[PDB]
Amino acid sequence: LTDRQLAEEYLYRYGYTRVAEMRGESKSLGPALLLLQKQLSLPETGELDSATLKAMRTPRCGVPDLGRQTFEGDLKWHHHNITYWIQNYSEDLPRAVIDDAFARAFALWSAVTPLTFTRVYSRDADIVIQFGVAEHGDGYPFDGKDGLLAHAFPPGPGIQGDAHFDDDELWSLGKGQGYSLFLVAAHEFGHALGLDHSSVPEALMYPMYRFTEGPPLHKDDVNGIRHLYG
Ligand SMILES: O=C(c1cc2ccc(C3CC3)cc2[nH]1)N1CCCc2cnccc2C1
Numbered sequence: 001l002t003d004r005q006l007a008e009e010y011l012y013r014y015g016y017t018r019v020a021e022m023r024g025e026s027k028s029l030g031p032a033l034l035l036l037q038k039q040l041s042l043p044e045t046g047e048l049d050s051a052t053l054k055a056m057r058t059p060r061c062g063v064p065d066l067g068r069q070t071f072e073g074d075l076k077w078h079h080h081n082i083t084y085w086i087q088n089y090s091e092d093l094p095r096a097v098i099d100d101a102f103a104r105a106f107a108l109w110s111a112v113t114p115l116t117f118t119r120v121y122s123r124d125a126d127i128v129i130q131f132g133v134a135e136h137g138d139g140y141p142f143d144g145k146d147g148l149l150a151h152a153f154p155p156g157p158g159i160q161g162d163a164h165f166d167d168d169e170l171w172s173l174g175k176g177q178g179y180s181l182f183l184v185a186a187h188e189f190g191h192a193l194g195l196d197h198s199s200v201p202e203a204l205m206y207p208m209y210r211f212t213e214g215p216p217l218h219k220d221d222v223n224g225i226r227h228l229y230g
């Protein structure tokens with residue numbers, strides 16, 4: 001992919017081109033670029049500059065930034081005890097390490113929400129967790145190694161609330177090689193609770209993958225959850 005081709009594909013996939021179409025301005029790259037620079041808190045130049053190309057090459061969440069599909073209901077949970085089922089496993093980590101990475105991701109949200117997170121072994125879990133490559137049965141295919149790492153669905157029935165992790169990625173704890181399953185799952189679980197992307201670079205719900213050894217929640221994430229659950 002050229003830089004220009006990557007830019008066009010990034011703008012399309014994350015919903016920038018569609019919003020530029022709604023504003024009569026999808027004939028040239030500039031307007032969609034300004035939308036993206038605003039959404040990602042980059043300098044608002046309207047140019048495919050070094051900061052914008054660096055942003056677009058950065059591994060990130062598969063969930064769109066402007067918009068979503070249409071889903072059922074008001075996109076928040078209406079019960080306190082959120083259940084999750086680990087449907088399958090990456091071979092990249094031991095099963096106990098994967099289970100713990102998901103438990104820890106949920107423990108992060110549990111402290112700042114009136115919700116509890118309980119593991120089940122059942123199809124009826126609120127949050128079904130699945131590892132998948134390319135087309136993995138929801139019509140929202142992954143893209144092979146790097147680029148988008150995962151996605152998740154807002155609260156509701158069936159696929160809603162589920163979290164999928166791209167197993168063309170190497171899953172680790174983010175040290176040496178591979179992406180931290182803990183940090184990606186913490187981000188995806190935010191979506192599964194009803195949160196959208198943050199435009200604050202340091203927030204967990206910022207769409208780009210950023211490795212840290214520090215506590216990953218920011219004021220913006222805690223406040224996001226507060227504006228959802230009473
Ligand atoms: O559109 C979504 C999608 C995720 C999501 C997360 C949170 C929320 C708000 C917080 C309540 C809405 C969401 N929509 N899809 C699920 C994510 C995958 C995807 C990828 N590209 C285009 C469309 C879709 C469909």
Ligand SMILES: [Ca+2]
Nearest residue numbers: 126158160161
């Ligand atoms: Ca579900």
Ligand SMILES: [Ca+2]
Nearest residue numbers: 144145146148
């Ligand atoms: Ca990928």
Ligand SMILES: [Ca+2]
Nearest residue numbers: 167168169170
């Ligand atoms: Ca893998």
Ligand SMILES: [Zn+2]
Nearest residue numbers: 061062063207
């Ligand atoms: Zn995301």
Ligand SMILES: [Zn+2]
Nearest residue numbers: 136138140164
């Ligand atoms: Zn999926």
